[PDB]
UniProtKB/Swiss-Prot annotation, chain B:
Lineage: superkingdom: Eukaryota
Protein name: DNA-directed RNA polymerase I subunit RPA2
Full protein segment contained here: 884 to 946 of 1135
Similarity field: Belongs to the RNA polymerase beta chain family.
Compartment(s) of residence: Nucleus, Nucleolus; Chromosome
Subunit structure: Component of the RNA polymerase I (Pol I) complex consisting of 13 subunits: a ten-subunit catalytic core composed of POLR1A/RPA1, POLR1B/RPA2, POLR1C/RPAC1, POLR1D/RPAC2, POLR1H/RPA12, POLR2E/RPABC1, POLR2F/RPABC2, POLR2H/RPABC3, POLR2K/RPABC4 and POLR2L/RPABC5; a mobile stalk subunit POLR1F/RPA43 protruding from the core and additional subunits homologous to general transcription factors POLR1E/RPA49 and POLR1G/RPA34. Part of Pol I pre-initiation complex (PIC), in which Pol I core assembles with RRN3 and promoter-bound UTBF and SL1/TIF-IB complex.
UniProtKB/Swiss-Prot annotation, chain C:
One GO molecular-function entry: DNA-directed RNA polymerase activity
One of the protein's GO biological processes: tRNA transcription by RNA polymerase III
Domain of life, per lineage: Eukaryota
Entry protein name: DNA-directed RNA polymerases I, II, and III subunit RPABC5
UniProt function note: DNA-dependent RNA polymerase catalyzes the transcription of DNA into RNA using the four ribonucleoside triphosphates as substrates. Common component of RNA polymerases I, II and III which synthesize ribosomal RNA precursors, mRNA precursors and many functional non-coding RNAs, and a small RNAs, such as 5S rRNA and tRNAs, respectively.
From Swiss-Prot, chain D:
Subunit relationships: Component of the RNA polymerase I (Pol I), RNA polymerase II (Pol II) and RNA polymerase III (Pol III) complexes consisting of at least 13, 12 and 17 subunits, respectively. Pol I complex consists of a ten-subunit catalytic core composed of POLR1A/RPA1, POLR1B/RPA2, POLR1C/RPAC1, POLR1D/RPAC2, POLR1H/RPA12, POLR2E/RPABC1, POLR2F/RPABC2, POLR2H/RPABC3, POLR2K/RPABC4 and POLR2L/RPABC5; a mobile stalk subunit POLR1F/RPA43 protruding from the core and additional subunits homologous to general transcription factors POLR1E/RPA49 and POLR1G/RPA34.
Pfam families the record matches: RNA_pol_Rpb8 (PF03870)
Region (Non-specific ssDNA binding): 15-39
GO cellular component: cytosol; nucleoplasm; nucleus; protein-DNA complex; RNA polymerase I complex; RNA polymerase II, core complex; RNA polymerase III complex
Keyword field: Acetylation, DNA-binding, DNA-directed RNA polymerase, Nucleus, Transcription
Family that this chain belongs to: Belongs to the eukaryotic RPB8 RNA polymerase subunit family.
Amino-acid biosynthesis as UniProt keyword: no
InterPro entries in UniProt: NA-bd_OB-fold, RPABC3
Name assigned to this protein: DNA-directed RNA polymerases I, II, and III subunit RPABC3
Naturally occurring in which organism (per UniProt): Homo sapiens
Curated annotation (Swiss-Prot), chain E:
Its biological purpose: Core component of RNA polymerase I (Pol I), a DNA-dependent RNA polymerase which synthesizes ribosomal RNA precursors using the four ribonucleoside triphosphates as substrates. Can mediate Pol I proofreading of the nascent RNA transcript. Anchors into the Pol I active site to monitor transcription fidelity and cleave mis-incorporated 5'-ribonucleotides.
Subcellular location field: Nucleus, Nucleolus
Subunit comment: Component of the RNA polymerase I (Pol I) complex consisting of 13 subunits: a ten-subunit catalytic core composed of POLR1A/RPA1, POLR1B/RPA2, POLR1C/RPAC1, POLR1D/RPAC2, POLR1H/RPA12, POLR2E/RPABC1, POLR2F/RPABC2, POLR2H/RPABC3, POLR2K/RPABC4 and POLR2L/RPABC5; a mobile stalk subunit POLR1F/RPA43 protruding from the core and additional subunits homologous to general transcription factors POLR1E/RPA49 and POLR1G/RPA34. Part of Pol I pre-initiation complex (PIC), in which Pol I core assembles with RRN3 and promoter-bound UTBF and SL1/TIF-IB complex.
Gene name linked to the record: POLR1H
Zinc-finger ranges (TFIIS-type): 9-49
Name recorded for this polypeptide: DNA-directed RNA polymerase I subunit RPA12
Motif Hairpin: chain residues: 32-33
Source domain of life: Eukaryota
Origin organism lineage: Eukaryota, Metazoa, Chordata, Craniata, Vertebrata
Family assignment from sequence similarity: Belongs to the archaeal RpoM/eukaryotic RPA12/RPB9/RPC11 RNA polymerase family.
Whole sequence portion shown: 64 to 126 of 126
Length: 107, 63, 64, 149, 52
């Protein structure tokens, strides 16, 4: 019933793990790939969809300098939430400053 | 098929958000391979494409 | 047969623009101005209403 | 210093064979302090070179100027102040052929050096006394910087 | 009573390496696909075919 699997490199290596994100596509995995690549503790972050008939993405996160790849994945999720909350705030504050000039101009 | 004798078989129904949208806002409707042309030499599908695009943009029907 | 409710390419409701397009062509507009003045700006939306053979006024003649 | 080569060149002709790849210009040159020619491909969007432009050239084995260490792995997150990047245009690729006009002798006085910088090639022909450290499949750097006089 | 085998095209021959071969087209598949081009060299008279 869960919707994230983690597939290690050799059962012991925790730097490379390929996250299998169930019920996603290039909507999330292209913007996660954008955030995790902004982390200088990542040698390699890329994604692929497994097969278009399927509904999951593979996400290879490959960390240099002794970190597990759960930390760039969590940081790239929170660091995308903190993009979208701010985009939501500056969008709900420019719709409001447009309705407050459509109305309060000549009416 | 088309009207220039160029059969296709329907291979994959591609979801709409994945289609290459244009600069006008439009997605396409059928994607056609550029490797169906050079052995078949249907120039008439090129002129029909320009012609039908320019007829749908003007309200004309082209001869 | 009858006008589609949505344009095929992008999902714009063009299915309400068939009577108010016959009404513009009966009132002497050109088809290059009866489609812009209905708000069909993309050439996939114009295509649905310019090249439409409304083949149900010919098919209801065979009625009980 | 791991400097395998260092000289001052002067562009005399740009793409004489006429092949004209996009974003890449071929730069035939001659030298000043040695007696050598040079046939280099650049990237012309980023670092533009026109004919008549002198520029210093350095081929080194390591970029760390504090000792020859030859790491190999590219780390963007680490920057050391002992890089040899006081130059402007820096490439990286390996030497794939060296050839010369030997006649039953070793290392004749006109030796070449063919370096392939990921696809952009190079021919540094000259005396064998100036091309010692070029072994085949040695991964060397290119370092150039435009002079103005 | 009593063609220079066609027009030339600059294609290198497989055997002798001459720069120009003479060609002849012919539509040997069905109408669904293709043409077929028969090349024929000038010097060594070698004949190969392609399916487009
Ligand atoms: Zn449309
Ligand atoms: Zn021949």
């Amino acid at each position: 019933k869960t919707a994230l699997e983690m597939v290690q490199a050799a059962g012991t290596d925790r730097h490379c793990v390929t996250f299998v994100l169930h019920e996603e596509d290039h909507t999330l995995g292209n913007s996660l790939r954008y955030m995790i690549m902004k982390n200088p503790e990542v040698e390699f972050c890329g994604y692929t969809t497994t097969h278009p008939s399927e509904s999951k993405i593979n996400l290879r996160i490959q960390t240099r300098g002794t970190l597990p790849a759960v930390e760039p994945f969590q940081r790239g999720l929170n660091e995308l939430m903190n993009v979208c909350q701010h985009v939501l705030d500056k969008f709900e504050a420019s719709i409001k400053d447009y309705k407050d000039q459509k109305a309060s101009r000549n009416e | 098929a088309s009207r220039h004798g160029q059969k296709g078989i329907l291979s994959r129904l591609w979801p709409a958000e994945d289609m290459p949208f244009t600069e006008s806002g439009m997605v396409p409707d059928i994607l056609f391979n550029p490797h169906g042309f050079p052995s078949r030499m249907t120039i008439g599908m090129l002129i029909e494409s320009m012609a039908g695009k320019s007829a749908a943009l003007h309200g004309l029907c082209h001869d | 047969m009858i006008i589609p409710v949505r344009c095929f390419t992008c999902g714009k409701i063009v299915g309400n623009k068939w009577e108010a397009y016959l009404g513009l062509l009966q009132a002497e507009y050109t088809e290059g101005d009866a489609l812009d003045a209905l708000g069909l700006k993309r050439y996939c939306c114009r295509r649905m209403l310019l090249a439409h053979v409304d083949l149900i006024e010919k098919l209801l003649n065979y009625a009980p | 210093a791991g400097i395998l080569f260092e000289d001052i060149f002067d562009v005399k002709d740009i793409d004489p064979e006429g092949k004209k790849f996009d974003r890449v210009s071929r730069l035939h040159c001659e030298s000043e302090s040695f007696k050598m020619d040079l046939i280099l491909d650049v990237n012309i969007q980023i670092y533009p070179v026109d004919l008549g432009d002198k520029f210093r050239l350095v081929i080194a084995s390591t970029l760390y100027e504090d000792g020859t260490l030859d790491d190999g792995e590219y780390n963007p997150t680490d920057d050391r102040p002992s890089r040899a990047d006081q130059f402007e245009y820096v490439m990286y690729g390996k030497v794939y052929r060296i050839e010369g006009d030997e006649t039953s002798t070793e290392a004749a006085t006109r030796l070449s050096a063919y370096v392939s910088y990921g696809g952009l090639l190079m021919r540094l022909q000259g005396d064998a006394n100036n091309l010692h450290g070029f072994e085949v499949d040695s991964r060397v750097y290119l370092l150039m910087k435009k002079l103005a006089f | 009573l009593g063609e220079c085998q066609g027009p030339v095209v600059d294609r290198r021959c497989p055997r002798c390496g001459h720069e120009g071969m003479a060609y002849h087209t012919r539509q040997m598949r069905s109408a669904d696909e293709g043409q077929t081009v028969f090349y024929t060299c000038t010097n060594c008279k070698f004949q190969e075919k392609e399916d487009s």
